[PDB]
Design a protein around this ligand. Structure first.
Ligand SMILES: CCCCCCCCCCCCCCCCCC(=O)OC[C@H](COP(=O)(O)OCCN)OC(=O)CCCCCCCCCCCCCCCCC
Ligand SMILES: NC(=O)C1=CN([C@@H]2O[C@H](COP(=O)(O)OP(=O)(O)OC[C@H]3O[C@@H](n4cnc5c(N)ncnc54)[C@H](OP(=O)(O)O)[C@@H]3O)[C@@H](O)[C@H]2O)C=CC1
Ligand code: SF4
Ligand code: SF4
Ligand code: SF4
Ligand SMILES: [Zn+2]
Lengths: 95, 48, 208, 176, 63, 114, 156, 340
């Protein structure tokens, strides 16, 4: 989900884009601006919320030692889903 | 990889690119941060 | 304390303390302090005026025979009025031992060169003149050995910054390598890494 | 506990003296050296045919740097700044801010490849296996500024070499 | 006696190799550093420090 | 206040050594002009020598001026033999550095430095 | 036109002769010179590609800056590059010869050899391996191959 | 004023100067000196090159990283010019040829190309345009060089009212074609001149003075719209100038009379070479043309640049042409020429 600036330049996931009057675009004429089209926010927004039947849950990111440090997430609030600090996966108590 | 293929993911490139240095498709470095200080734009109306 | 703690050598500690007492009582004119570290190393802090009469003793006495000069070093500690600390490391092949001799001087007072004791120091203290500014009196050839030919200042002093005051670049107008004031593209980021909690209670200085 | 190298005393008898004189007048050991070169002429040379025949490597090889991802699309780095604090040549510059969904993510991640010494301190100090040292080493450029990698280049390198980086980590993760 | 009498003040300004611009325009500060209030340890406030005034730091055009 | 002298017991011997060093430099300048093939005149080199000597003219300490004489003799020895290059000799003439602003107004115009 | 084809074929011939007969100079400073000698080892065998070391700058084609270019060394390197006959190419290898490497903030280190001499190919690493240096040499050969000297001379 | 154009630093190599300069024809002599002076201040220089990129390689150590952007351009293509000048705030024109090639004549280099560059710079919003012409440019001159240079100067002034036109007299330097040409006449014979060259008066100017004048004119807000004339401090005759050149180079000087009509006859013989010619008829005409005096045009002194005399840099220029016997002689071992 990369939007295009009115100058034709692409906008990164950070939101960086050179202005119309910015001279530094001379570094891009005759060449290309390297941006990544796989945005992490849009890809993590497509992950479904996992329903679990426990008050607290443990997340390690998957793979065991190949993931992030294991953390514990509380799911007492029913209005919002508890999200992992590292992986961004969200869990919900099904009650 | 014919007998032991790697695990496929959504973000992995399906088209490999060789060394692009010296080509028009070469990498150009740039800052990836927004502007820090926001200047005060003057009003577009005279004081009269 | 068996598998992790480094084993302690007490026989070498006792022998080095006895030899330190021996050296201190042989030369009471120049020897100021004698200490033995916890890992069994002997330090003889002496007066600068006895740089020569001590070293030759350790070179020529039948009970010392420190025939090898391993390293000649200088330490810059700006908190003292005599900021420079010249350290000699001696190796005795006959008795299979090592000793350390320390002395102090400031920027202006010269100290006597030991080229008549060990000739390796002919280069070594010359290196000190290149990087600390300690002038060694009575030297055959004292000049710069490591820095640039037109370099000014002593780089290993603590008040000297990391990057120098000049840098070299090629200029095509004068067809020459020219020196210009330094302008770092990215500054060396100074990190504050000192822990605010006391670590070793055994080295706790008494308060004022 | 020591041996007397080069202290053997030569002989004196007439046969050995005649042998030494014959070796002097007829150059026997020069013929021995010629024979050793002639023996080395008839061996298989150890030359590989680059670039069709790459030299052997190891899965622990340190080359170009890359940024990994979790197996859902999310980038692994959470901007903890351990790699830039452990980098000995200060090649890593990190700037971070909370993004739209409140996740601790980077905004600037720059590695200066001309400053980097390729020692793998960042790939071993990373708590979430985000930054890795990939196995690529054929990435020489024609310009100096092309060796100044920003976050986008590192993410593209990670997406390019994930299929190899994951296998190398799966091979070598039990030794760490 | 091999000793002389020197009564003038010390001056190593001409031997340190520093240019005069970074001698006559600098203003050093000698202070005991302030304790970090986020922590509670007091070991960083033991020794006096000499620091210099902060000069201009700008942004690189490239990176 | 009793210190250890380096070479001069008082100011007279030190300024005599300064005088001898200046004589040696003044004699040496035409040879370094000739050998290094510099594009400058002998008078320019001699006035540069005079400027470098008058830069340290405020020193009233025998040990400091003794060290200055030692460093000057070291530089003279380094330039008698060709150990310095043309760049090292010509670095006394800042031919590539633009003159900085001098008065208050131009320094106010060009930056924040005092 | 036939003249354009003639100058194109002549440019191809001279580029082939210049790129298949590279003569570097025996010039190392540090660790990266040890890796360069390992590129000269029997395994990688630079002399297969016509790459043979020459001691004198007057009979050399390229110069490989392998090591740390310090402040005391830069005039010597500049004079050595100046003495080489045209056409001359410089391959910068190692982090020290690229941007200062470990010693970027040192007082007596030139931050890259680009400040002294023009550079064609930058080879990154510490040290960049003999395989990587051979790859850089082949990349330099490819850069020489696509030169357009006589074509531009005909156009000018 | 955008925040990326505000100057910063101490004016060093890594500082920001806020000058975005497009130097057309920067792969030459004056272009090389101008790029060197701009790059040491920390400026973004866009260099459009027509020749081989290898010849641009010497322009690489001339500034910091990312400061010099090389790009292809064509003199008859306005699209490449608009690609090059679309972000710069100062455009400098150094395009010139001492001879006429098969593809380009003097009108294609001095008339059409500067007019196209100035028009594209005007339509792209560039606030500063600087053009380089010749001091002796006039319509009625015998040489086609000065005629076309005057025509191009008039067209540039017409299409760009704020253009700063700079007219050097005759620039000498290490890579010039003025003193080196005189030192290289000695191969052919005994350096012939028109009536011994005792009637033409010339005042050559150092290259660094012209470069500093251009830099100051870029930095001067009051230099827009003017027509400067860059001249040397002393006016010499041609005979004494050649005499001083051969005295510095330590070569024998044996001049001889030779008529004006026969000089062009052999001058056109050297121009039939397909490579760069040694001399042409136009070079003979411009060498034997006396430098006009225009006191109304402001000079190097009004831009704060002191004119360096020829006696200070002539030895530096001409030490390459000496033999081994007199290679080590100093600067002061020569007699300076008499000025008028
Ligand atoms: C009107 C028509 C005529 C017009 C005038 C032109 C006349 C002919 C001029 C010479 C030939 C021009 C063409 C030159 C080659 C062009 C094609 C080319 O570059 O081929 C590349 C190929 C090698 O490819 P490479 O990139 O090295 O592959 C990697 C290997 N894994 O290269 C090869 O496979 C080898 C190429 C060999 C080229 C020919 C042999 C050399 C020249 C011999 C004749 C001249 C010299 C005679 C002797 C002089 C004294 C020694
Ligand atoms: N004698 C002197 O030095 C004097 C010179 N001048 C003027 O000053 C200017 C600068 O002189 P200078 O640099 O030394 O001259 P040069 O001939 O040495 O260099 C000309 C430059 O412009 C380029 N160029 C020339 N013709 C064309 C063209 N038709 N199309 C595209 N690019 C072209 C050249 O590139 P490439 O390498 O591709 O040819 C080169 O970069 C010129 O206009 C000259 O007339 C004025 C007074 C005195
Ligand atoms: S490999 Fe080492 S030098 Fe390179 S970025 Fe990582 S920590 Fe820094
Ligand atoms: S160590 Fe890993 S998680 Fe921490 S800032 Fe570096 S790349 Fe990100
Ligand atoms: S880049 Fe690394 S391997 Fe090469 S010379 Fe420098 S420290 Fe040695
Ligand atoms: Zn998780």
């Amino acid at each position: 989900g990369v939007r295009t600036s009115p100058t034709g330049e692409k906008v990164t996931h950070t939101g960086q884009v050179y202005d119309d009057e910015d001279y530094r675009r001379v570094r891009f004429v005759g060449r290309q601006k390297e941006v990544n089209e796989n945005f992490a926010i849009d890809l993590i927004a497509e992950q479904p919320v996992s329903q679990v039947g426990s008050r607290v849950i443990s997340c390690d990111g998957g793979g065991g030692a190949l993931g992030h440090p294991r953390v514990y997430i509380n799911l007492d609030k029913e209005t919002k889903t508890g999200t992992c600090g590292y992986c961004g996966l969200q869990f919900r108590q099904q009650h | 990889p014919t007998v032991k293929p790697p695990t496929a993911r959504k973000f992995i490139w399906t088209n490999h690119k060789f060394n692009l240095s010296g080509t028009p498709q070469q990498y150009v470095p740039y800052s990836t941060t927004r502007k820090k200080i926001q200047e005060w734009v003057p009003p577009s109306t005279p004081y009269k | 304390t068996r598998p992790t703690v480094r084993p302690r050598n007490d026989v070498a500690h006792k022998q080095l303390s006895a030899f330190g007492e021996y050296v201190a009582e042989i030369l009471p004119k120049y020897v100021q302090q004698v200490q033995v570290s916890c890992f069994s190393e002997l330090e003889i802090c002496i007066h600068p005026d006895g740089v020569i009469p001590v070293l030759t003793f350790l070179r020529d006495h039948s009970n010392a025979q420190f025939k090898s000069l391993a390293d000649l070093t200088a330490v810059d500690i700006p908190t003292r009025q005599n900021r420079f600390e010249i350290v000699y490391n001696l190796l005795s092949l006959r008795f299979n031992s090592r000793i350390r001799v320390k002395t102090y001087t400031d920027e202006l007072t010269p100290v006597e060169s030991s080229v008549s004791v060990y000739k390796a120091a002919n280069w070594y203290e010359r290196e000190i003149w290149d990087m600390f500014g300690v002038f060694f009196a009575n030297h055959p050839d004292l000049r710069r050995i490591l820095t640039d030919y037109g370099f000014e200042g002593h780089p290993f002093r603590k008040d000297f910054p990391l990057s120098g005051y000049v840098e070299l670049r090629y200029d095509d107008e004068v067809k020459r390598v020219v020196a210009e004031p330094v302008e770092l593209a990215q500054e060396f980021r100074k990190f504050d890494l000192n822990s605010p909690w006391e670590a070793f209670p055994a080295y706790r200085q008494p308060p004022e | 506990t020591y041996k007397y190298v080069n202290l053997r005393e030569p002989s004196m008898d007439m046969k050995s003296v005649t042998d030494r004189a014959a070796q002097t007048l007829l150059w026997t050991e020069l013929i021995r050296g010629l024979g050793m070169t002639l023996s080395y002429l008839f061996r298989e040379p150890a030359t590989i045919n680059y670039p069709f025949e790459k030299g052997p490597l190891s899965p622990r090889f340190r080359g170009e740097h890359a940024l990994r991802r979790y197996p859902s699309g999310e980038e692994r780095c959470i901007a903890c700044k351990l790699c830039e604090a452990v980098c000995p040549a200060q090649a890593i510059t990190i700037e971070a801010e909370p993004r739209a969904d409140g996740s601790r993510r980077t905004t600037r991640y720059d590695i200066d490849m001309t400053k980097c010494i390729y020692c793998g301190f960042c790939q071993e100090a990373c708590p979430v296996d985000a930054i890795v040292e990939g196995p690529n080493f054929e990435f020489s450029t024609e310009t100096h500024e092309e060796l100044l990698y920003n976050k986008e280049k590192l993410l593209n390198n990670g997406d390019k070499w994930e299929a190899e980086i994951a296998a190398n980590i799966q091979a070598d993760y039990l030794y760490r | 006696t091999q000793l002389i009498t020197v009564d003038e003040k010390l001056d190593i300004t001409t031997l340190t190799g520093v240019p005069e611009e970074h001698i006559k325009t600098r203003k050093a500060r000698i202070f005991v550093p302030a304790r970090n209030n986020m922590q509670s340890g007091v070991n960083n406030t033991k020794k006096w420090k000499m620091e210099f005034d902060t000069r201009e730091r700008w942004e690189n055009p490239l990176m | 206040t009793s210190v250890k002298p380096i070479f001069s017991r008082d100011m007279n011997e030190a300024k005599r050594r300064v005088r001898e060093l200046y004589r040696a430099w003044y004699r040496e300048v035409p040879n370094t002009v000739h050998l290094f093939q510099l594009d400058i005149s002998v008078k320019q080199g001699r006035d540069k020598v005079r400027e470098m000597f008058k830069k340290n003219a405020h020193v009233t300490d025998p040990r400091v001026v003794d060290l200055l004489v030692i460093k000057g003799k070291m530089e003279l020895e380094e330039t008698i033999n060709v150990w310095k290059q043309r760049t090292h000799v010509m670095r006394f003439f800042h031919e590539t550095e633009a003159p900085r602003p001098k008065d208050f107004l131009s320094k106010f115009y060009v930056g924040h430095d005092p | 036109s036939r003249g354009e084809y003639v100058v194109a074929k002549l440019d191809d011939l001279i580029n082939w002769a210049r790129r298949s007969s590279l003569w570097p100079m025996t010039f190392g400073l540090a660790c990266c010179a040890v890796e360069m000698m390992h590129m000269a080892a029997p395994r990688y065998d630079m002399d297969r590609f016509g790459v043979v070391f020459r001691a004198s700058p007057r009979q050399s084609d390229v110069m490989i800056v392998a090591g740390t270019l310090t402040n005391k060394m830069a005039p010597a390197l500049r004079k050595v590059y100046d003495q080489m006959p045209e056409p001359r190419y410089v391959v910068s290898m190692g982090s020290c010869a690229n941007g200062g490497g470990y010693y970027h903030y040192s007082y007596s280190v030139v931050r890259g050899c680009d400040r002294i001499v023009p550079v064609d190919i930058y080879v990154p690493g510490c040290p960049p391996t003999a395989e990587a240096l051979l790859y850089g040499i082949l990349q330099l050969q490819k850069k020489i191959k696509r030169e357009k000297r006589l074509r531009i001379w005909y156009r000018r | 004023l955008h925040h990326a154009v505000i100057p910063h630093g101490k004016g060093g190599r890594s500082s920001v100067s806020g000058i975005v300069a497009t130097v057309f024809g920067a792969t030459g002599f004056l272009g090389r000196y101008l790029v060197n002076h701009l790059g040491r201040m920390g400026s973004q220089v866009i260099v459009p090159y027509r020749c081989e990129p290898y010849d641009t390689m010497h322009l690489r150590p001339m500034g910091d990283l990312g400061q010099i952007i090389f790009m292809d351009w064509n003199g008859r293509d306005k699209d490449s010019i608009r690609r090059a000048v679309e972000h710069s705030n100062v455009v400098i024109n150094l395009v010139g040829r001492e001879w006429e090639t098969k593809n380009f004549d003097f009108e294609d280099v001095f008339v059409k190309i500067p007019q196209a560059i100035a028009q594209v710079s005007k339509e792209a919003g560039v606030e500063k345009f600087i053009h380089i012409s010749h001091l002796n440019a006039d319509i009625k001159s015998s040489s086609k060089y000065l005629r076309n240079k005057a025509v191009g100067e008039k067209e540039v002034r017409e299409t760009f009212p704020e253009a700063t036109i700079i007219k050097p007299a005759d620039i000498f330097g290490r890579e010039d074609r003025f003193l080196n040409y005189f030192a290289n006449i000695r191969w052919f014979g005994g350096v012939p001149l028109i009536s011994l060259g005792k009637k033409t008066v010339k005042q050559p100017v150092y290259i660094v003075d012209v470069t500093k004048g251009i830099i100051n004119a870029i930095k001067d807000p009051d230099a827009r719209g003017k027509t400067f004339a860059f001249v040397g401090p002393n006016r010499y005759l041609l005979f004494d100038l050649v005499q001083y050149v051969f005295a510095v180079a330590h070569r024998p000087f044996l001049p001889y009379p030779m008529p004006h009509f026969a000089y062009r006859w052999i001058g056109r013989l050297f121009e039939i070479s397909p490579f760069e010619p040694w001399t042409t008829r136009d070079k003979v005409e411009r060498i034997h043309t006396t430098d006009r005096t225009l006191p109304h045009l402001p000079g190097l002194e009004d831009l704060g640049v002191q004119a360096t005399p020829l006696e200070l840099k002539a030895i530096e220029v001409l030490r390459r042409h000496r033999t081994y016997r007199w290679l080590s002689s100093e600067i002061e071992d020569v007699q300076p020429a008499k000025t008028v």
